[PDB]
Design a protein around this ligand. Structure first.
Ligand SMILES: Nc1ccn([C@@H]2S[C@](CO)(OP(=O)(O)OP(=O)(O)O)[C@@H](O)[C@H]2O)c(=O)n1
Ligand SMILES: Nc1ccn([C@@H]2S[C@](CO)(OP(=O)(O)OP(=O)(O)O)[C@@H](O)[C@H]2O)c(=O)n1
Lengths: 238, 238
């Protein structure tokens, strides 16, 4: 529908360079999909060649093995998340000049490798190889232009996940109820640290040209849309 | 059909460990698909949980951009070939104990990065990052047990490719007739060197427990099947 995998030539009129790049940053079941789909449609209405990319686009067929056999599959499935996200951005954002609304940016994947390194599922040597490739890939992708910091509390994530799994609107990704609870909590803690890093790197680090926006994951979806649209509308190019 | 992406539990009876691993090694349009599909069916008939994997399984949606925009897409598309092959082997051969008949083994992908490094499409720094990840991935996969060296001459490859493209039985992967001709020739030269390396490493290197089998890419498909089956039938486990 959104022409995400077109290997044909760029069609951006007279506008040169990459499109613009909006990303949500937060733990699972933060309430992202209504937001990013609405934003992509409103940016298109303003004349932007914009697309919204749900993270489910990047779910490998083998995703569940990351969580049921993590010391075997966490390293290559983490490579898959960063590689497939990279390729989609390199083609759509950079090569074809389109504007992206992402449920997760290329800057967030490293924290998921950190989680598996701490648990022991990914070795230090695997992490070093990952980081070498990640640095080369990320150097070819512009920083996100607007990052929405939206980290849900763990019990909110788990309530939303439980309802979605019960009604069959998403699959059961974890090997046990406790594995789901534990990964959600470990990711929550890492995301709190990552967002504090973001606040620093937007002032004294590599993101001084990027806008950060804080957003409560428990806010109503209409409030989320209104808050993020007020900043995203400014980024429209034809 | 062959249950290649099953994240459910192993079902191998009392047999432990990985399955066995047969790979063809040669340039494009060597005449591989009839061979590997016939071999997988005959191994299954003998009671092996065997599968044949065509290389088209690993073609990324963005494959054509490797060849039309190589200095942007050769590095990540080469990462995709080795990552997707790795995951399929890690699940089917190792985790689930199945026997594989592959159109290309995990040992051959590095030569395709070498081609792009020589041309300048992949930088030396990108190649080093690739090699770091490749070493970690390959350390988790058994060597192939039987490698069939089948490298076609370039004009034979190009005649077969031209007929397949003309009748629509495969897509036109290259941006020009000359790009197709040139990549086929550069790969041919690299494969001749790779096969000479293979002959050494099966005696004095890391493949002393692997069988090599020479096969003319211009031989009739019935001769190919008979020659390879005479060695592959020995590798059947129930
Ligand atoms: N590098 C990464 C990126 C994502 N994930 C999983 S993939 C997942 C599935 O639910 O999250 P989603 O991004 O798809 O969004 P959602 O749950 O809020 O709807 C969730 O388990 C993430 O931790 C991961 O392990 N490694
Ligand atoms: N690491 C790799 C592996 C494969 N290829 C391409 S993918 C291709 C498409 O035709 O070959 P196939 O393996 O799919 O088999 P075939 O042509 O004989 O039918 C051919 O261009 C290969 O060089 C590549 O660039 N990098």
């Amino acid at each position: 529908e959104q022409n995400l995998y077109d290997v044909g030539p760029r069609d951006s009129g007279g506008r040169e360079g990459p499109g613009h790049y909006i990303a949500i940053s937060g733990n699972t079941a933060a309430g992202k999909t209504t937001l990013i789909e609405t934003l992509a449609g409103s940016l298109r209405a303003a004349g932007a060649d914009a697309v919204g990319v749900s993270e489910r686009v990047f779910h490998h067929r083998y995703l569940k093995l990351m969580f049921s056999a993590s010391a075997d599959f966490a390293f290559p499935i983490q490579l898959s998340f960063m590689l497939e996200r990279h390729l989609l951005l390199l083609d759509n954002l950079v090569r074809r000049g389109r504007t992206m609304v992402m449920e997760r940016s290329h800057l967030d994947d490293a924290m998921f490798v950190r989680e598996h390194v701490a648990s022991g599922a990914i070795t230090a040597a695997q992490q070093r190889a990952y980081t070498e490739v990640s640095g080369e890939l990320n150097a070819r992708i512009p920083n996100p232009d607007l990052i929405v910091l939206m980290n849900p509390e763990p019990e909110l994530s788990l309530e939303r996940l439980a309802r979605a799994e019960a009604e069959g609107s998403r699959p059961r990704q974890f090997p046990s109820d406790a594995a789901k609870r534990a990964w959600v909590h470990r990711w929550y803690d890492l995301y709190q640290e990552l967002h504090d890093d973001y606040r620093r790197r937007a002032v004294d680090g590599d993101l001084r040209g990027t806008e950060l926006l804080e957003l409560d994951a428990a806010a109503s979806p209409e409030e989320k849309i209104a808050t993020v649209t007020a900043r995203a509308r400014s980024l429209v190019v034809g």
